[PDB]
Symmetry: D2
């Protein structure tokens, strides 16, 4: 029954993400939007033997037709990192992209769940919320910064070191999605795992800089796309199941938060029919994890304020 | 715990195909090969929280290490069509690519299931077979021209016309993978469907030209990639299920055949632990379908000889 | 003075060709046409400190505006070779592109000089001529297959071997533009040069296979672009100079001919105000060269017929 | 004659720049360097009928061989802007690229003229100087930030508005190559021109944002390439002419300067056999122009410090 729009469907993330959505029985209609190539991408995907009806839309003229009646909107639309850059370096391009696309969402599908993949997530969620406020349809239970890839990485790396099946592993990751703002709560990992402090520090750093590690590995050919398609699909599926009344669906996501000093913050969230059913908070943490939370807050606030400031200028 | 190799893993089909394989609990090891970008694609995929060990390989020296111990090899390696071109127009580039890569398979994983995606399939499978013969390891029950996208398309188009769930539709498609050699056996469709003639003729033509319609829709930006990834993955999973002893696994594929005077031909195949368990043949068809088979034969034989001749000039 | 349209201006040849045209004092108006990116290319070029006014057009709806009042139309529009392919392998894509674009020329600027770059030149010129005939505006003095790169290459290769300045060297090249149809008349080279037959044979083959050499050096990243822009520019400048009344302007070009049994053939042409002033013919040649001409005719006639037959099916 | 190296020769600027350099009688040896595609680009260019010997080099191992014996080195190597970005947003990628490539220059052709195209020029020239200083081979007369495109643009826009031939317009542009630091001295334009203030501010705005204008018009497909190749070629030709003793050659360029409080600044430079013969200074300007200079200092200083501070962390 779910109608899902992918804004930026023709890109590195957008195409495999759209493939995973098309493959799912949770999706009945898939609308694809981009400024280039969408008709070809949609034609391609429309041949797949699943029930989701696929349609491609090209350029701002066809954006309203893409968004009409949407339950979920996922937004990988943006520009990726080159080696050396921070996610923040992308602000001046993606801020405008996110502001433009979310403005269309506020106008044409204000009740949809808005899932922002476009970086820097720490600032693009603040932008999304302010754009919705300006249009008078701000619902903080329906706006999500997709940080799922951090959790997915943490699970993989913990499983590698301990020789576990990654599907059996769950590591809560909190804070935001940039360098030190990525805080993996290894103390809260299921199953219980014990690492020496030096291993834990390297593991923590490995998780924090994993995006940069992939950017380096690609050597100028973009950033994480396939693993991000996986994580984005995972988050959308969790959300859609929750919207269909499945109980106990928990995902971490960068959202409007009162858990800390920061106006936006990522914690585990009980999802449901209203979107965010309950923010489960940070919970019990180690001293090591407590310090990381403290050290990250200054950056998060700066990133939050930057996105808010940007929206003032429009 | 299938070990799967993808040759051409950095390309348009290769990347989404590798994602789908990595996502599957049927795969324990995923080895990726290409002439460029493999390390970045593998790094990307290795972060996904599934059990499959991913490694990327790059350049001639590393190709043997990518292939050793594989149960299945998929080869999308090759150049794609531009609008106007036939798949046959790709021959003079892709013949050498398929010959080289299948020679490496014959040397380093002769017992694997060889799944050729590279076009024109009607000639590249004969190439593959002749290359394996030269190395004295030709097993016709383990070499497959992947025609699965034709069936996937037929299922979707039949489902759309009748208002059915395409998950429940299964259309046998026989012959080859080029224009008029693609013969959808609508008379053998399950569930049985009765179409008025004008719909049946349009349906048949749509299935035959589907690849060209995607090429035209992409306007120079390649051919079907996401739906081909889906179809390739489906075929590998069918192969793996059969290898694990699942009974009644049937797929159409362009293989060594005695069904017609064409030495290679696509029919439904019962798959087993050693590849093709039993060629189920053409079966009973309509007069319309019989005519299409007769009309397909001259082209198929020409594409076959073309592939064979190429190997004899080396 | 001259108004020049470039059809396929966003491509590998198109962009640098357009750069060289924009840089020229012979050009006062430069219209650029493609199916993508033309606006950005024109904006780029419009900033250059020369008099030529640049305008970019996008899509068939805008093709008449681009063509109106043109003195010369250059057509690099098409698709390039990958390693292994012949120029003839491009036929099925480029035949339709050339037929479509030259039909628009016939309608909107029938008086213009039509310079065809798109391959295979041995077929695309016949196609161009037949399209103009169907519109009833055929002028054999104004339709040119651009072979100029063959002359340029011959000049360079002869100059390297004799330690000469390639600017001082002129080698007539006749026949067509593919494989052994490329016939460099080394016996007519100015300055006079002597090679023993073994060197001459090697030099001749190098000139013939030079296009394939570049395709293979680019390893899938296209064919000759920059040197073709140079050759394309040179031919257009010769044509405009001749149109401005300059005397003794001679260029080889594949055109409607009666110098052989081939209805199209490349020989040195004296250019004038109305296009071809006089075909200077083959002239006196060696037995080596005479033999090459005789052996080339069957391929040329087959390529010519193929182009003619294509237009008959429109 | 001049031995010129192009570092980043396979890119959007690099290829047509190399074409222009190959076409010139001033160049005797053209060495092309990149991390990809150079052998194909060199093959392509080597067929052009001019005397310049063209060689391609690939990967940091061959970089010393590309630089040895060079008189001039031009460096477009780097990443370009996407719409919305400033040139400074490129710093965290391009800084390391320039530092690496200029370190190789300092090691292998310390006596050569170094022309940096890579952005942001306001920081990358300071990086080049400090890198040369670290190797003890700093010569401020030989290091040039290519701002030439600003002058070319100014000339075109002035000529447009005043119905002049842009080839005989000369507008000095001073300061730097980023937004408000681009300061066109319309008061010093030859021939003399006068605009109403509202027009002059519009003209000045146009020149300053001209780079963004092209970036936006290309809509994600890169930045100015063809006009930059023209501008880079012009500057190299001016520089090579002056090295051959041609007199009266003047170009604006971002260089080590003491005309203002900024350590680096762009002013008209008389070029000579040793590089900079004389810095011709800012000269007499209007109060409008003086205000802009004053407004630009803080930004210029910041960009300079950024570049300097980067090299101090190596
Ligand atoms: N949330 C995460 O953990 C996470 C992970 C990976 C990547 N990302 C971010 O996702 C974004 C997309 O990355 P990618 O690899 O797909 O880049 P990409 O360039 O491959 O694809 C981006 C797509 O966005 C489209 N687009 C750009 N502007 C648009 C517009 N104004 N309207 C419609 N479409 C537009 C482009 O045309 C392109 O098709 C980047 O900002 C990247 O940093 C986030
Ligand atoms: N079986 C089918 O029905 C079917 C379906 C779709 C596409 N195809 C064919 O699949 C092929 C690839 O299509 P695509 O869309 O992925 O094209 P693509 O250009 O996106 O990718 C092709 C990949 O092949 C790789 N490659 C080329 N030569 C190689 C070599 N020698 N060794 C290793 N890798 C090499 C390239 O690096 C590239 O990554 C084409 O020939 C296309 O026609 C077949
Ligand atoms: N005459 C010669 O000796 C000679 C020399 C070199 C190349 N060529 C031929 O020139 C052609 C172009 O080569 P390239 O390297 O520029 O290829 P390219 O792909 O880089 O560029 C071709 C351009 O043509 C455009 N195009 C395609 N279809 C079009 C259409 N229908 N309408 C308008 N534009 C269209 C494309 O969009 C692209 O911008 C090739 O066929 C090549 O074989 C001929
Ligand atoms: N000086 C100016 O006024 C001016 C004007 C235009 C563009 N630029 C800058 O020029 C740079 C290149 O622009 P472009 O449009 O050609 O971009 P492009 O991406 O088309 O070209 C990039 C080229 O640099 C190469 N490269 C990247 N890293 C390299 C390395 N480490 N070593 C060798 N080569 C490397 C790439 O392989 C590619 O060939 C950009 O930074 C752009 O902002 C400056």
């Amino acid at each position: 029954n779910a109608k899902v729009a992918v804004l930026g469907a023709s890109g590195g993330i957008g195409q495999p993400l759209s493939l995973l959505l098309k493959n799912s029985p949770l999706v009945s209609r898939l609308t694809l939007y981009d400024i280039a190539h969408t008709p070809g991408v949609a034609a391609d995907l429309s041949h797949i033997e699943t029930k989701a009806a696929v349609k491609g839309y090209l350029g701002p003229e066809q954006l309203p037709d893409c968004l009409k009646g949407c339950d979920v909107v996922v937004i990988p639309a943006g520009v990726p990192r080159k080696p050396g850059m921070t996610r923040d370096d992308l602000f001046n391009t993606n801020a405008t992209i996110v502001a433009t696309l979310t403005a269309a969402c506020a106008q044409h599908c204000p009740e949809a769940m808005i899932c922002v993949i476009a970086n820097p997530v720490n600032s693009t969620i603040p932008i999304t919320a302010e754009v919705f406020k300006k249009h008078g349809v701000y619902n903080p239970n329906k706006i999500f910064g997709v940080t799922t890839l951090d959790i997915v990485r943490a699970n993989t790396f913990v499983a590698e070191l301990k020789g576990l099946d990654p599907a059996r592993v769950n590591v809560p990751v909190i804070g935001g999605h940039a360098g030190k703002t990525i805080i993996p709560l290894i103390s809260q990992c299921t199953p219980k795992v014990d690492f020496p402090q030096d291993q834990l520090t390297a593991l923590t750093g490995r998780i924090q800089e994993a995006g940069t590690e992939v950017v380096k590995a690609k050597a100028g050919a973009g950033s994480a796309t396939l693993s991000m398609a996986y994580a984005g699909a995972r988050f959308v599926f969790s959300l859609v199941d929750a919207m269909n009344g499945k109980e106990g669906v928990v995902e971490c996501s960068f959202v409007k938060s009162q858990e800390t000093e920061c106006t936006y913050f990522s914690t585990p969230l009980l999802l449901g029919k209203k979107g965010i059913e309950k923010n489960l908070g940070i919970g019990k943490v180690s001293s090591f994890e407590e310090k990381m939370i403290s050290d990250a807050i200054p950056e998060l606030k700066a990133s939050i304020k930057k996105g808010e400031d940007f929206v003032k200028t429009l």
